[PDB]
């Protein structure tokens, strides 16, 4: 299918109780493979998938050096964002950065991004051309006009449209049993008596990869969303994901309903029905 690589960075100020908690995690599709925690003893960039271990020490040396750069950059942007917004040293704020690239079935470049938020709000983002910037507000304008005058989108575009794509591929070849497997959802249905007159059907997807799934309920062929309850797609912690939808139905009417399951490891959609 398509694939993506995406680095997520989280910096959190403890005003005068040390220096900001900085956390960085890299991901190929929905597999994390690297992390860095400021409060970690190692102060290294660190493997969290087997395939990446096989890379040599210069890959590890340099990744440590670069990620310590993102940290200091976050560490400064907090102090600068306090000014722009005229906030008070007596208060913990958060900055978040997210950037990566997607490749198609062919693994050619598809799209890149470079997002940035202050205190859980959109601040500045590379638009899709990767030759301009979206501001959230007037602070951003100032930042965008520093990034216009220093040619930042061009520099970014060179990473995302080049090196992101070349390394994502590399990783994809090296983790071929992990990253390039399509583990199909293993499905079943279950039944609970909620009350006298009514019952719940729950429709399960388990042990699937990647996370992207669509779990759909029908009644006589017509999509029913009213009187359902979808959970968000969660992990089992073995790099497989899970999910269920349910409906409350009238007692006896249960023959009529059907849950419908679409995932890329399923050669054709699955239907389940009660009885």
């Amino acid at each position: 299918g398509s694939h993506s690589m995406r680095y997520f960075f989280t910096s959190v100020s403890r005003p005068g109780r040390g220096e900001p908690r900085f956390i960085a995690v890299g991901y190929v599709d929905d597999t994390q493979f690297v992390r860095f925690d400021s409060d970690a003893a190692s102060q290294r960039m660190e493997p969290r998938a087997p395939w990446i271990e096989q890379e040599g020490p210069e890959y590890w040396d340099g990744e440590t050096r670069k990620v310590k750069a993102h940290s200091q950059t976050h560490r400064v942007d907090l102090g600068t964002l306090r000014g722009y917004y005229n906030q008070s040293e007596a208060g913990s704020h958060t900055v978040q950065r997210m950037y990566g690239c997607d490749v198609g079935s062919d693994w050619r470049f598809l799209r890149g991004y470079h997002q940035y938020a202050y205190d859980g709000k959109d601040y500045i983002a590379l638009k899709e051309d990767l030759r301009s910037w979206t501001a959230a507000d007037m602070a951003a304008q100032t930042t965008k006009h520093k990034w216009e005058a220093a040619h930042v989108a061009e520099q970014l575009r060179a990473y995302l449209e080049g090196t992101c794509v070349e390394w994502l591929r590399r990783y994809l070849e090296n983790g071929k049993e992990t990253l390039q497997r399509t583990d199909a959802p293993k499905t079943h249905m279950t039944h609970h008596a909620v009350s006298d007159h009514e019952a719940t059907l729950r429709c399960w997807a388990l042990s699937f990869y990647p996370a992207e799934i669509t779990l759909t309920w029908q009644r006589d062929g017509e999509d029913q969303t009213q009187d359902t309850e979808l959970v968000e797609t969660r992990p089992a912690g073995d790099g497989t994901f899970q999910k269920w939808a349910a409906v409350v139905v009238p007692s006896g009417q249960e023959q009529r309903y059907t849950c419908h399951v679409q995932h890329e490891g399923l050669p054709k959609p699955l239907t389940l029905r009660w009885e």
């Binding site: 890299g26 960039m45 750069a69 993102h70 930042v152 970014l156 992101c164 390394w167």
Partner: peptide, 9 residues
């Protein structure tokens, strides 16, 4: 591979 463009608000 992490990017390498360090530029600040």
């Amino acid at each position: 591979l992490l990017g390498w463009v360090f530029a600040q608000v």
